[PDB]
């Protein structure tokens, strides 16, 4: 049975300006099967009310999915994306970097 | 979307 | 230029949990405009772009019955294919279907697509001739004979060359202010020393539509693809896309490197430098 590990990117909709309104995105792609749990963590804690796009897929049949919330970046705040997939022994955490 | 008036298309 | 319409269906069986989840999405180019969710409350085809909302109740009724139809077809197909592959009753499995059309700048039909997958790999697919099928394995050969006998390919081609293209053309006019616009990338460059010897050059492209873009690095005019970390193009979540390309250079030589940005919304390809 084919199972593929999701690629992950954590990023903001616009370049981060401290104190200004923005969107924090976590793009999961290239995974199979379709079941997945994606969380955005503010300072190590889950954020409530995080939306996601509708489940679609690429030509290679692998799924992609855009999770997002609205936030205003500050310096003291750390952000991460926790991705839960059967392909992973434990949830993969990716910190948000302002230049990736 | 396909007006699937069929399922002359079951697998 | 050229445009496309695309529908993607995903049916995932959940043994015991209940009835197979069914997800349907429609795209014009890189823009999603409709959606259906079996587990959602409404049980209707929902708009996901503004320009589709000018379609009346008859449209929404037709699309909802067509998409509920498809959901029930995948239901029995899930059972059948489990039987083809001698799989247990207690396993979850995935049928994925894709069809759609391409049109030229004149709106004339270019290509039709119809492809199905089981568990993330090819199952059966319509050919370029819109007449014959291609089976991936032996299970798909059984489906291929049924489809031959029922003349499904003729139905497929009739749709792809008719309803599909003319509704593609309708959407491009009705949503002209959104679908036929090209947003050029907002570029800029970043820099990150990794040591006193070596530093990272990253070339950004943001806020661009459609998704198709090309980023290349060049040291002294020769192409670079031997250091270029290319990230997969990503959605910003506002209808635009992003991409970056990074290169590691020996410090002091960064003026040798140029990033090249090719995009549809660009009169001519951009060039950047640190």
Nearest to C237 among A2, A54, A68 (CB): A68
Last residue of a domain, one of C126, C153, C181: C181
**Contacts A32 to C, Cβ<8 Å:** 94, 119-120
Same domain for C136 and C106, yes or no, is yes
Handedness of CA C261, C265, C268, C270 (dihedral sign): negative
Here the CATH number for the domain that contains residue C152 is 3.30.500.10
Residue A26: helix, strand or coil by DSSP? Answer: strand
Using the 8-state DSSP alphabet, how is residue C55 labeled? S
Alpha carbons A60 and C10: distance in angstroms, whole number? 14
Same domain for C150 and C214, yes or no, is no
Last residue of a domain, one of C181, C197, C216: C181
Alpha carbons C194 and C8: distance in angstroms, whole number? 43
CA distance C63 to chain B (A): 6
CA distance B11 to chain C (A): 5
**What does the domain layout of chain A look like in residue ranges?**
1-100
What length is written for chain A? Answer: 100
Asked if C140 and C123 touch (Cβ cutoff 8 Å), the reply is: yes
Listed residue (A36, A37, A33, A69) closest to A50, CA to CA = A69
Last residue of a domain, one of C146, C181, C216: C181
Domain of C211, in residue numbers: 182-274
**Contacts B8 to C, Cβ<8 Å:** 150-152, 155
Same domain for C252 and C139, yes or no, is no
Handedness of CA C66, C71, C76, C78 (dihedral sign): positive
CATH 2.60.40.10 holds for A1-100: yes
Asked if C234 and C241 touch (Cβ cutoff 8 Å), the reply is: yes
Supply C265's token pair: 């919304």
Alpha carbons C214 and C21: distance in angstroms, whole number? 37
Tell the burial category of C137 from Cβ atoms under 10 Å away from its Cβ (0-12, 13-18, 19+). middle
Same domain for C47 and C59, yes or no, is yes
Asked if A56 and C32 touch (Cβ cutoff 8 Å), the reply is: yes
What length is written for chain C? Answer: 274
Asked if A85 and A32 touch (Cβ cutoff 8 Å), the reply is: no
Same domain for C70 and C189, yes or no, is no
Handedness of CA C230, C232, C238, C239 (dihedral sign): positive
The answer to whether the Cβ–Cβ distance between C152 and B9 falls below 8 Å is yes
Chain A and chain C share a number of CB contacts under 8 A equal to 78
Q: Would you tell me the crossing angle of helices C138-149 and C152-161 to the nearest 10 degrees?
A: 80
Same domain for C198 and C160, yes or no, is no
Question: What would the 3-class secondary structure string for C77-103 be?
Answer: HHHHHHHHCCCCCCCCCEEEEEEEEEE
Supply C44's token pair: 């209707």
Please report the resolution in angstroms: 2.6
Q: Which residues are bridge partners to C159 per DSSP?
A: none
Same domain for C38 and C105, yes or no, is yes
**Contacts A27 to C, Cβ<8 Å:** 234-235
Same domain for C188 and C267, yes or no, is yes
Listed residue (C237, C30, C185) closest to A23, CA to CA = C237
Same domain for C43 and C167, yes or no, is yes
Here the CATH number for the domain that contains residue C264 is 2.60.40.10
Listed residue (C5, C22, C9, C35) closest to C170, CA to CA = C5
Alpha carbons A77 and C173: distance in angstroms, whole number? 45
Alpha carbons C207 and C243: distance in angstroms, whole number? 9
Nearest to A27 among C8, C98, C235 (CB): C235
Alpha carbons C215 and C272: distance in angstroms, whole number? 11
User: What is the distance between the terminal CA atoms of chain C, rounded to a whole angstrom?
Assistant: 33
The answer to whether the Cβ–Cβ distance between A61 and C120 falls below 8 Å is yes
Chains that touch A (3 or more CB pairs under 8 A): C
Alpha carbons C111 and C129: distance in angstroms, whole number? 10
């Amino acid at each position: 049975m084919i199972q593929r590990t999701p690629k992950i990117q954590v990023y903001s909709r616009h370049p981060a300006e401290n104190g200004k309104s923005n969107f924090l995105n976590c793009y999961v792609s290239g995974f199979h099967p379709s079941d997945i749990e994606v969380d955005l963590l503010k300072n190590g804690e889950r954020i409530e009310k995080v939306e996601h796009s509708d489940l679609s897929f690429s030509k290679d049949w692998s799924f992609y999915l855009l999770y997002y919330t609205e936030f205003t970046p500050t310096e003291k705040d750390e952000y991460a994306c926790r991705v839960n997939h059967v392909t992973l022994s434990q949830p993969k955490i990716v910190k948000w970097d302002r230049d990736m | 979307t396909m007006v699937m008036e069929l399922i002359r298309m079951i697998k | 230029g050229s445009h496309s319409m695309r529908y993607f269906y995903t049916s995932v069986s959940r043994p015991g949990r209940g009835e197979p989840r069914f997800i349907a999405v429609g795209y014009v180019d890189d823009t999603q405009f409709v959606r259906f969710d079996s587990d959602a409350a409404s049980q209707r085809m929902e708009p996901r772009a503004p320009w589709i909302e000018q379609e009346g109740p008859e449209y929404w009724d037709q699309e909802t019955r067509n998409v509920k139809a498809q959901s029930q077809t995948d239901r029995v197909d899930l059972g059948t294919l489990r039987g083809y592959y001698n799989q247990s009753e207690d396993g979850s499995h995935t049928i994925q279907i894709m069809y759609g059309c391409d049109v030229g700048p004149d709106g004339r039909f270019l290509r039709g697509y119809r492809q199905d997958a089981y568990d993330g790999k090819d199952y059966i697919a319509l050919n370029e001739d819109l007449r014959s099928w291609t089976a991936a394995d032996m299970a798909a050969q059984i489906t291929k004979r049924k489809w031959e006998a029922a003349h499904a390919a003729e139905q497929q081609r009739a749709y792809l060359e008719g309803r599909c293209v003319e509704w593609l053309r309708r959407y491009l006019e009705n949503g002209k202010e959104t679908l036929q616009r090209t947003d050029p990338p907002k570029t800029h460059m970043t820099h990150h020393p990794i040591s006193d010897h070596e530093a990272t050059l990253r070339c950004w492209a943001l806020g661009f539509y459609p998704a198709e873009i090309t980023l290349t690095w060049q040291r002294d005019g020769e192409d670079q693809t031997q250091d270029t970390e290319l990230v997969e193009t990503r959605p910003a979540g506002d209808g635009t896309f992003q991409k970056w390309a990074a290169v590691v250079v020996p410090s002091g030589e960064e003026q040798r490197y140029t990033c090249h940005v090719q995009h549809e919304g660009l009169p001519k390809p951009l060039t950047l430098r640190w």
